[PDB]
Design a protein around this ligand. Sequence first.
Ligand SMILES: C[C@@H]1O[C@@H]1P(=O)(O)O
Ligand SMILES: C[C@@H]1O[C@@H]1P(=O)(O)O
Ligand SMILES: C[C@@H]1O[C@@H]1P(=O)(O)O
Ligand SMILES: C[C@@H]1O[C@@H]1P(=O)(O)O
Ligand SMILES: [Zn+2]
Ligand SMILES: [Zn+2]
Ligand SMILES: [Zn+2]
Ligand SMILES: [Zn+2]
Lengths: 189, 189, 194, 194
Amino acid sequence: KTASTGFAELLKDRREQVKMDHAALASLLGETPETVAAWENGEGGELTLTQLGRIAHVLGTSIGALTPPAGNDLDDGVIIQMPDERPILKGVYYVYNCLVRTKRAPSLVPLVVDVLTDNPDDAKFNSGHAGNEFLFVLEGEIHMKWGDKENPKEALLPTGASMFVEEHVPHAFTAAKGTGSAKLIAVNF
Amino acid sequence: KTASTGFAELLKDRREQVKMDHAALASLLGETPETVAAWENGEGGELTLTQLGRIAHVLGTSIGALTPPAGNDLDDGVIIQMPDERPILKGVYYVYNCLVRTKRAPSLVPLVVDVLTDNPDDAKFNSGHAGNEFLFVLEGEIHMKWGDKENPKEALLPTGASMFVEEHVPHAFTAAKGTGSAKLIAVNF
Amino acid sequence: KTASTGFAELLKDRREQVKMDHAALASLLGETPETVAAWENGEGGELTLTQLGRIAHVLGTSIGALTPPAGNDLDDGVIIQMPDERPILKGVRDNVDYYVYNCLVRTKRAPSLVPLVVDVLTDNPDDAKFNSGHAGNEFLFVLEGEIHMKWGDKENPKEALLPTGASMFVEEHVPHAFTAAKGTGSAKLIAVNF
Amino acid sequence: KTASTGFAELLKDRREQVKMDHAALASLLGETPETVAAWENGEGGELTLTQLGRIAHVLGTSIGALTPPAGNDLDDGVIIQMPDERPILKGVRDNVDYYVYNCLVRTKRAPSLVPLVVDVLTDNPDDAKFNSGHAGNEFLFVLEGEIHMKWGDKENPKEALLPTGASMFVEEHVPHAFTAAKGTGSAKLIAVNF
Ligand SMILES: C[C@@H]1O[C@@H]1P(=O)(O)O
Ligand SMILES: C[C@@H]1O[C@@H]1P(=O)(O)O
Ligand SMILES: C[C@@H]1O[C@@H]1P(=O)(O)O
Ligand SMILES: C[C@@H]1O[C@@H]1P(=O)(O)O
Ligand SMILES: [Zn+2]
Ligand SMILES: [Zn+2]
Ligand SMILES: [Zn+2]
Ligand SMILES: [Zn+2]
């Protein structure tokens, strides 16, 4: 779980996986065998990002492969979030109502979004993001734009329309012209 | 895209990958080299599931590896579903309002669910399913049960609570006792 | 038979996921619910590739997702191969007998593993014949003789003379050719595609 | 330096995904937004493993997700190794010099690839010494001599006598031991962990 206990275990596995003893690995890093042994005893807590990049280099792998997963925040498979546990965040316009996330699925980023603008001309595109995205119009009408922001594709979405946006596809939302505001629920995954 | 064009191409790749010529592969299947060549020309459309299992066996792989992906139903990254394109389905109680799906992410199964019962004693558990699951209480109160149906864990979820259910975790929903009915939006992914 | 069983189980799983009962799927397919029940009861054996594609399509997924993995052909996690039992296959590129593939152990538990002793017959690097790269990553070892390897752009390749004991890695889709070193007659590779 | 750059880029990506600005993250971490901007400007080099874990935790993900892949050490998709350049390492299990590992080519583009010529020094199958299985799948080839292989439950193992040219596959975590065939002195394996 802790960075240094995950790292200690993974480091020993990797080192062994490539047949190095403490001495060999130590030679490659400007440390003693006793120091490398210490990292493997959970004493790597102070290693810098740069040093970690070097350890990962000499063992022909990534920092990823030497550090633990995000962890387990689940009560027997479940995490719950109560309505007023959420934070409210800005545009830069949208207002974000962040719903339940979990380290057992870091991709899951579900939001309730209030869409403050109803002037499709003001649509602020994002350059497309890392996961796929399910969306559902909660209240009102959404004017959606996607693809190339130069020559976009557009759609008018009444209340209760659902839509999917593939990863890295640039997109933008606004309420339908002169309808004031709409509400989206978004599930990035 | 079509089953037989995907299969034709994948079959040729696999056969070549394991160094077999048409003759060699044919010997293993009770066909002529000319017949195997035909499959590789898109003429495998009539092959049975059982025959496909055999082809996959002799090439030391799965039917999966020899057939195309689900396909692409996206208009430049996006698919949209209008409110009244959805089907309404039964319990066996819940009423399902199936939202937008896509072959580019077959796991995505988003639903609006009406929960018809408000007697937690009547909760019908499912044995847990294949994907992860995000849920959001749309209207009313949900009495949720999960884990072992013998000795379950339970939670009361007010309107606008969000929850995550890990894959294969058995779970059941009902409205809070004597509250009539509630609405969930579920996103299986 | 295990194919029909795995399909039966994965058909039921997928149908339940999209919230369709026997009737809904059966209608979307122009079948009776009994037939679909039958399929889900191990009776899908005779369905065609084309019918399977239809089923996968209606279910918004792939035939692959509805079919079981390649099975387990291991004996407590191990499969062995004795030198006598190797499939031997020819490698002809023009009309020229270029390689002889001696096929090493393979297993349905790691389908992409394709190891080989490759007899490298030609020894004139000038007539080296490129593949167009292939799907797997590849580990290679000079087993006997000396090898003249070419890779990358066939017009202007990178090159290496590799003696007995040399080892190389070729990343997927990277095009490559081998002959024995000019005038040495023949050489041998262990190639491990994974 | 490429570590700090990749972190900088992946930190910004992740922060934007969870909809936090510089201020929100900075506060959740007891830092100023300027420091977080600095991190996102390639200045994260000196952050500790522990600080990284905190950052990953607040961002509900893993350090791995915030750090770049192992780089590319290939020359147009190929890396070669000449027999002279092999790392040589000893394999001692009790006080006994059991194996000699000659390390073959490896690459950051397929970190799990670990090929070896293994010199098998012992030739008394009775004193065969098991590992506890390991992470990768493994392909093996009898390079020289004859091998006595044991696998599975060390109390009651499965076994194989394998002559020169035999090939085997060992699935991950399956425990296994090798010696040379009783009384033949020594043998050689090519082992390819992948
Ligand atoms: C993530 C929710 O769709 C909005 P964004 O992608 O515009 O932030
Ligand atoms: C999928 C939606 O959660 C409900 P179920 O899992 O009870 O069908
Ligand atoms: C496997 C040996 O490299 C050759 P090929 O990949 O062209 O067959
Ligand atoms: C790699 C050779 O099999 C032995 P080891 O895995 O025990 O080192
Ligand atoms: Zn988005
Ligand atoms: Zn569910
Ligand atoms: Zn090759
Ligand atoms: Zn091993």
